[PDB]
Structure 1
């Protein structure tokens, strides 16, 4: 966010694309676990119990 920088543009371009992929994957995984309700079984084994 400072004036015009030839290098700052590529930094904020790669960074913007990176954070875009990150937030997209976050939303996608959140929908994946609000849609897929798979009952996880805790500590079935006796030794871990």
Structure 2
């Protein structure tokens, strides 16, 4: 539902995983691109903080 969708997305971005994963093909496409986005963005945060320090 909408509240569990928000929780799944938040946990994915914080790399904390979840208690439910999408089972359909459309849910898994959405989950996969959000996982890729999360990986690039968090690596970019750590890398640029290392540069600044």
Query: Which TM-score applies when normalising by structure 1?
Result: 0.61
| Greater radius of gyration (CA) | 1
- Unmatched runs of 5 consecutive residues or more in structure 1: 35-49
Cα root mean square deviation, aligned: 1.4
Equivalent pairs counted in the alignment come to: 34
Query: Which TM-score applies when normalising by structure 2?
Result: 0.57
**Any runs of at least 4 consecutive aligned residues in structure 1 with deviations exceeding 2 A, and if so which?**
none
Higher relative contact order (CA 8 A, sep 6+): 2
- Unmatched runs of 5 consecutive residues or more in structure 2: 1-19
As a proportion of its length, which structure holds more helix?
A: 2
